[PDB]
């Protein structure tokens, strides 16, 4: 937390912008108006995203990632979620 | 108490004839000590005294000065000038503060009374040395432009008479409308240095003493 | 020093949006920190401080990151631009205790904007800016003199337009010759925070302070 | 008299002077002229002509 005010003196945004910044950093691609670095420090299990505006670059909040192994099960869950949401969207398509 | 802050405010600009400094100057005739007033935005060069401090600077600021407070209250009382007749007035420029002495002179003995102008009392300074600011803006920048509009109305009178059947006959009475816009255009490049010059108080006390009385009244 | 202060005197007056007091500010942020000489006409911000104060303000306001003092003054020279009409650098109307009043959380968690602050002094009403102001007075007064003599000459021209004029008169309005004594009288007697000062001398100062 | 406006003869001074002279004559004859305030978006705005042309 608290990773919001770090830009408050830097670019002088307003509050709550961090919520949208985080949401669009989580969603596919970078922010439409916010620069982000998309990487992963496997050595430290840590993620970070950027925030630059008004003629100077700065460092937005970051993910203190936690390493939990067994990628197989979580990948299976993710792909099952993909297939199920495709199926429900197709059902909505045919009903409509 | 208004004899060193209000009456001092109601004192027209009149640069006292100092010997070293060319800064703004005027001294107020009081029964409660001589009063300077120098308004130049953010380094007070002001000389204000009461009976007590004039008594002190009589008894200790000069090697030979037996003149009591009443002596200097009379000297200032027997003074009619924010200027110098030569009470000999002289300047010893030791600081940007206007060294403004009113000697122990009453048309006679030039008894010793010298100055090191202190940073005067801020109560009688900040109250009525900033009044120049808003009073001066609100009065000058409106009345000067209204007089320009009086020019414009008289030029409208000229032009509508001329088009109504009062055509020009000679160059002496040939004067088409003159506006304040082109006037400012030419003045800021030609007559601005002539009329932006505090100097030694030569133009500072003739177009600006009554102007500044209007300033302080406003 | 010289070029900062001289170009600052040449820098147009800036009215930082504070809505509490009146800010007559001069901004020239090129080197030696942010030379934002603000003056509320009752307490000057001698804010020509070097980049050290800029870094101090950057760090005192970023509680878990940093803002480079060079970059801090650079983007404050970009942050004051959406302020002369954001992080509005509001300051209290008090003429003796001057603290920036930027009181709003830009984070959801507490944060504020503040510059280095100075208070009133007994010696703050006789340094520079009433010399250009009093030069504006002389400029406007000599302009008055020229306008006035042109008034008088033009009115004597108008007297010719009385004997040589043919203006339609319905008799509901009469125009008198332009007097001179009552003219000077009205110029003296009849016609006559810090907000009025600043919005009155935004343009006339730079146009006259050149001397 | 029914109008909200005295500008027609408020335009030319000669006809206005003649009209007021005639009205004074009619007052001498004993004719009492009366004028009404009429609807006008700019109001009646009296005395443009009719200030002393009313008995």
From Swiss-Prot, chain A:
Which tissues is this chain's protein expressed in? Widely expressed.
A Gene Ontology cellular-component term: nucleoplasm
Give UniProt keywords alphabetically.
Chromosome, Coiled coil, Cytoplasm, Disease variant, DNA damage, DNA recombination, DNA repair, DNA-binding, Dwarfism, Isopeptide bond, Nucleus, Phosphoprotein, Ubl conjugation
Top-level lineage group = Eukaryota
GO terms classed as biological process: base-excision repair; cellular response to lithium ion; double-strand break repair; double-strand break repair via nonhomologous end joining; immunoglobulin V(D)J recombination; positive regulation of ligase activity; protein localization to site of double-strand break; response to X-ray
In the record, the effect of residue 54 to E is given as:
Abolished interaction with NHEJ1/XLF
Give a short account of its post-translational modification.
Answer: Phosphorylations by PRKDC at the C-terminus of XRCC4 and NHEJ1/XLF are highly redundant and regulate ability of the XRCC4-NHEJ1/XLF subcomplex to bridge DNA. Phosphorylation by PRKDC does not prevent interaction with NHEJ1/XLF but disrupts ability to bridge DNA and promotes detachment from DNA. Monoubiquitinated.
Q: Provide the protein's localization.
A: Nucleus; Chromosome
The effect of residue 7 to R is: Abolished interaction with NHEJ1/XLF
Gene Ontology molecular function: any one: FHA domain binding
Q: List the disulfide bonds.
A: none
Task: Return the similarity comment.
Answer: Belongs to the XRCC4-XLF family. XRCC4 subfamily.
Q: Kindly identify the disorder that the protein's record connects it with.
A: Short stature, microcephaly, and endocrine dysfunction: A disease characterized by short stature and microcephaly apparent at birth, progressive postnatal growth failure, and endocrine dysfunction. In affected adults endocrine features include hypergonadotropic hypogonadism, multinodular goiter, and diabetes mellitus. Variable features observed in some patients are progressive ataxia, and lymphopenia or borderline leukopenia.
What is the name attached to this protein's record?
DNA repair protein XRCC4
Q: Which organism is it from?
A: Homo sapiens
- What range of the intact protein is shown? 49 to 144 of 336
Swiss-Prot record, chain C:
Phenotype when changing residue 126 to A: In 6A mutant; abolished phosphorylation; does not affect ability to repair double-strand breaks (DSBs), possibly because of redundancy with XRCC4 phosphorylation sites
Which consequence is recorded for altering residue 26 to A?
Abolished ability to participate in V(D)J recombination
Q: What is the effect of changing residue 111 to D?
A: Abolished ability to participate in V(D)J recombination
Q: Which GO terms describe its molecular function?
A: DNA end binding; DNA polymerase binding
Query: What does the annotation give as the result of altering residue 129 to A?
Result: Does not affect ability to participate in V(D)J recombination
Q: What is the effect of changing residue 189 to A?
A: Does not affect ability to repair double-strand breaks (DSBs). Does not affect interaction with XRCC4
On assembly, the entry states: Homodimer; mainly exists as a homodimer when not associated with XRCC4. Interacts with XRCC4; the interaction is direct and is mediated via a head-to-head interaction between N-terminal head regions. Component of the core long-range non-homologous end joining (NHEJ) complex (also named DNA-PK complex) composed of PRKDC, LIG4, XRCC4, XRCC6/Ku70, XRCC5/Ku86 and NHEJ1/XLF. Additional component of the NHEJ complex includes PAXX.
* Record's protein name: Non-homologous end-joining factor 1
Q: Which gene encodes it?
A: NHEJ1
What range of the parent protein does this fragment cover? 1 to 224 of 299
UniProtKB/Swiss-Prot annotation, chain D:
Highest taxon in the source lineage? Eukaryota
- Leader peptide range in chain numbering: none
| Cell compartment(s), UniProt | Nucleus; Chromosome; Cytoplasm
List where this protein forms a coiled coil.
none
Query: What's the PTM story here?
Result: Phosphorylation by PRKDC may enhance helicase activity. ADP-ribosylated by PARP3.
What induces this protein's gene, according to its Swiss-Prot or TrEMBL record? In osteoblasts, by FGF2.
Q: What else is known?
A: Individuals with systemic lupus erythematosus (SLE) and related disorders produce extremely large amounts of autoantibodies to XRCC5 and XRCC6. Existence of a major autoantigenic epitope or epitopes on the C-terminal 190 amino acids of XRCC6 containing the leucine repeat. The majority of autoantibodies to XRCC6 in most sera from patients with SLE seem to be reactive with this region.
Q: In UniProt terms, what function does this protein have? A: Single-stranded DNA-dependent ATP-dependent helicase that plays a key role in DNA non-homologous end joining (NHEJ) by recruiting DNA-PK to DNA. Required for double-strand break repair and V(D)J recombination. Also has a role in chromosome translocation. Has a role in chromosome translocation. The DNA helicase II complex binds preferentially to fork-like ends of double-stranded DNA in a cell cycle-dependent manner. It works in the 3'-5' direction.
The Swiss-Prot or TrEMBL record describes its family as follows: Belongs to the ku70 family.
Subunit = Forms a heterodimer with XRCC5/Ku80; heterodimerization stabilizes XRCC5 protein. Component of the core long-range non-homologous end joining (NHEJ) complex (also named DNA-PK complex) composed of PRKDC, LIG4, XRCC4, XRCC6/Ku70, XRCC5/Ku86 and NHEJ1/XLF. Additional component of the NHEJ complex includes PAXX. Following autophosphorylation, PRKDC dissociates from DNA, leading to formation of the short-range NHEJ complex, composed of LIG4, XRCC4, XRCC6/Ku70, XRCC5/Ku86 and NHEJ1/XLF.
Entry protein name: X-ray repair cross-complementing protein 6
State the organism named in the record.
Homo sapiens
- Name of the gene: XRCC6
Residue range from the parent sequence: 168 to 222 of 609
